[PDB]
């Protein structure tokens, strides 16, 4: 479903640096480029935001 | 025999980013610290929801599961009691002295997608308010379908759940402190010195672009890779950096995530501290005199 | 979470009724937000004067009520399908798995 | 007050003995059952 | 041919028991009856809960399909716990259950009669049947932790 | 009620093994090492038998010099008076920023 509130592990909340990534991932940054920007600096918190499935988009058709 | 005396020094101090010193003292002071300032100071979370009609995509059970982890601001965490410490108000409403009412409605009439967002929850009671950038996501809906539902907050100790553990990231390091053998370091060739700078992980050891000499440059983030002793080991030297770690001078890199504040979660962990190292020592009085 | 389903049919005179089984609307069927519990009723079906034969739940079945159907095709028989939600936390008996077959129970 | 909405029709219709079950201003036999204004509780822990 | 009073759940590790004990969780032992008579002491104590629950001190049965050698069949003191539904026991002891952890069951035989509850821990019980009489030699051996263990404290120097 | 129990071993003179209840590593690990401070203390440690309840046991074997009850509220009151002094040396750094 949704991205996650907060991470699974370390408990940094990051449900709210989600549309702010797709609107730095419509330029032409790197995915390991964007993630900098949004000051994350663990591999733990920087997973969610990487591999996340956005089924909502597909899911608000009917 | 008698107690200790620590000495601290604070390199940097913003909101959530508290990085300080800990020095003359032993692991089990830096981590018996550690391990109640990540769960056992006690915040505020949503606890109970009261969902009246939900219209969303969303299952009514996902959406309890998400609003009990936004991060709720306390400033009263300390001075309130807990849901049964509090025999009174019988729950489910504002009893200001254990619980918090919570008013979420949202309704989209238009033609495009509105999502709500965490700042939508309005508080009968303005000192517990969620923290706030867009914000938190909850639900998307489409044109027709509208959610409503009453949420009750309270106090509680992050030990049962993780969301009322305020302390996301909290740890130590022993910070080390490196020596170079001054009179092995001739014997390698400049190749050899460079070899032996581009091994290590993280920048560690530099060089002086005056007389190629090893210069310690930020010993701190050593990280403890055992890459640049055993890179000598295998060589022409052996024994030349002997890295052995400090009994003391840790340093402290706490996490707030928002909820309190970071000078407020150290001092909270030692007021705590102080009272669970109370009940034990007069229960055990009567049978010493 | 696991979502379930409980179908019947209904083909004197079989019909959904009320048969009188706490939480139940006037057409024999949960409405939905009703916490069922084991052992009991998730389908009013009885006849004319009193004749109740229903579709009672197991000992090791819960869960609460998320939709319910209702569907006829063309011999003239109705049909009815209760879909009951419950979401599970992993326990301590859980079973994962890997992709390489290190398969394994949760142990703490 | 209990409602019986349409498949893919959209027409709010009350089955009361329905012995067949269609919808009026449609041809379709698909009643799914509308959600009331219950209130339920669930914890988050 | 079946028999009543019985279970069967599944089994995980669990290295704080002892050897001859099991771990019966709360759902289990609220249900499980074992039959008893009274006596001049309790009196007060079962009239205030005959049929009383699964309390510990009594003894069950033990087995893992399928039965493979003599040694698979041991009866061990049972001892409740707060667990969410699962049964635990030693992890070294489960070399005479030939089985792992990876999903085996266990089937728990519950006696009744008090001529089949003396006899379980005299000749059944795992403080009896210590010598493998197949091979005769030990039964219980070291696991695959504690083994690693001894050896890494006798090597290592 | 009665949170700390005490159980006076009889085997071996001038020896303890105090227990608490509803406790966790957090004290276990803090009240061993001020032990282990001490110049009359020869064994100091924390056991968890079982984690499913939560029970800590501290053993204390001290000499003939003082009593293995008398050797525990100096290890207390030396924590409790040494986080007095950590909270004064914080709470003037905080306001110096
Ligand atoms: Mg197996
Ligand atoms: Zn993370
Ligand atoms: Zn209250
Ligand atoms: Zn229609």
Redesign the pocket.
Same mark, same amino acid.
């Given at each position: 479903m949704i991205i996650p509130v907060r991470c699974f592990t370390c408990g940094k909340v990051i449900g709210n640096k989600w549309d702010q990534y797709l609107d730095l991932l419509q330029l032409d940054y790197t995915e390991g480029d964007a993630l900098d920007a949004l000051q994350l600096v663990r591999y733990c918190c920087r997973r969610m935001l990487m591999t996340h499935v956005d089924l909502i988009e597909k899911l608000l058709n009917y | 025999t008698y107690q200790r005396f620590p000495k601290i020094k604070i390199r940097e101090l913003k909101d959530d980013y508290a990085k300080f010193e800990l020095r003359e003292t032993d692991v089990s002071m830096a981590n018996a610290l550690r391990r109640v300032m990540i769960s056992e100071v006690p915040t505020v979370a949503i606890d109970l929801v009261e969902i009246e009609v939900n219209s969303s995509v969303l299952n009514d059970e996902f959406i309890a599961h998400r609003l009990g982890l936004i991060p709720l601001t306390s400033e009263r965490a300390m001075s309130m009691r807990f849901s049964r410490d509090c025999d009174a108000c019988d729950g489910d409403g504002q009893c200001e002295f254990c619980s918090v009412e919570f008013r979420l409605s949202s309704k989209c009439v238009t033609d495009q997608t509105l999502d709500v967002t965490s700042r939508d929850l309005y508080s009968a009671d303005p000192t517990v308010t969620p923290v706030d950038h867009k914000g938190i996501i909850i639900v998307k809906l489409r044109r027709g379908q509208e959610l409503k539902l009453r949420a009750i907050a309270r106090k509680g100790i992050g030990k049962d759940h993780a969301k009322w553990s305020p302390a996301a990231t909290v740890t130590f390091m022993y910070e080390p402190d490196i020596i170079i053998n001054e009179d092995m370091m001739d014997t390698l060739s400049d190749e050899e010195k460079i070899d032996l700078i581009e091994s290590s992980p993280t920048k560690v050891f530099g060089m002086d672009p005056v007389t190629r000499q090893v210069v310690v440059v930020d010993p701190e983030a050593y990280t403890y890779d055992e890459e640049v002793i055993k890179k000598a080991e295998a060589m022409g030297k052996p024994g030349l950096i002997e890295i052995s770690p400090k009994d003391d001078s840790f340093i402290f890199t706490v996490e707030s995530t928002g909820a309190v504040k970071a000078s407020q979660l150290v001092l909270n962990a030692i007021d705590l501290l102080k009272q669970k190292l109370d009940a034990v020592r007069l229960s055990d009085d009567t049978v010493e005199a | 979470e696991q979502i379930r389903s409980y179908k019947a049919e209904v083909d004197e005179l079989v019909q959904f009724g009320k048969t009188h089984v706490d939480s139940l609307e006037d057409d024999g069927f949960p409405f939905i937000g009703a916490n069922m519990s084991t052992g009991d009723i998730v389908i009013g079906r009885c006849t004319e004067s009193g004749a109740d034969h229903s579709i009672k739940l197991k000992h090791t079945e819960r869960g609460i009520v998320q939709k319910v159907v209702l569907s006829s095709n063309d011999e003239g028989k109705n049909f009815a399908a209760v879909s009951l939600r419950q979401v599970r936390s992993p326990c301590l008996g859980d079973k994962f798995s890997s992709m390489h077959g290190q398969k394994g129970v949760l142990g703490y | 007050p209990v409602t019986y909405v *349409? %498949?893919? =029709? %959209? !027409?709010e219709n009350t089955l009361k003995s329905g012995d067949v079950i !269609? =919808?009026?201003? *449609? %041809?379709?036999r698909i009643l799914y059952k509308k959600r009331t204004r219950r209130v339920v509780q669930y914890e988050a822990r | 041919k079946r028999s009543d009073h019985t279970f069967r759940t599944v089994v995980v590790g669990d290295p704080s028991l002892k050897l001859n004990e099991i771990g019966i969780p709360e759902s289990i032992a609220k249900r499980l009856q074992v039959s008893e008579h009274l006596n001049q002491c309790n009196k007060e104590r079962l009239v205030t809960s005959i049929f009383r629950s699964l309390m510990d001190g009594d003894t069950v049965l033990m087995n893992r399909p399928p039965s493979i050698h003599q040694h698979s069949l041991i009866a061990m003191t049972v001892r409740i716990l707060p667990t969410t539904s699962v049964v635990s026991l030693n992890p070294i002891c489960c070399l005479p259950f030939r089985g792992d952890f990876d999903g085996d069951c266990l089937h728990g035989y519950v006696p009744q009669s008090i001529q089949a509850k003396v006899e379980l821990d005299e000749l059944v019980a795992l403080d009896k049947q210590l010598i493998n009489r197949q091979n005769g030699r030990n039964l219980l051996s070291l696991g695959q932790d504690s083994l690693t263990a001894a050896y890494l404290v006798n090597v290592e120097k | 009620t009665k949170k700390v129990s005490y159980d006076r071993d009889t085997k071996i003179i001038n020896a303890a093994s105090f227990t608490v209840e509803r406790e966790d590593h957090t004290i276990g690990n803090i009240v061993r090492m001020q032990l282990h401070r001490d110049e009359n203390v020869l064994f100091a440690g924390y056991q968890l038998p079982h984690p499913l309840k939560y029970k800590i046991i501290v053993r204390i074997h001290t000499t003939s010099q003082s009593s293995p009850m008398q050797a525990y509220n100096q290890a207390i009151n030396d924590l409790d008076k040494e986080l007095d002094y950590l909270k004064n040396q914080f709470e003037a750094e905080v306001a110096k920023f």
């Open positions: - | - | - | *349409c %498949g893919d =029709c %959209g !027409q !269609q =919808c009026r201003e *449609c %041809g379709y | - | -």
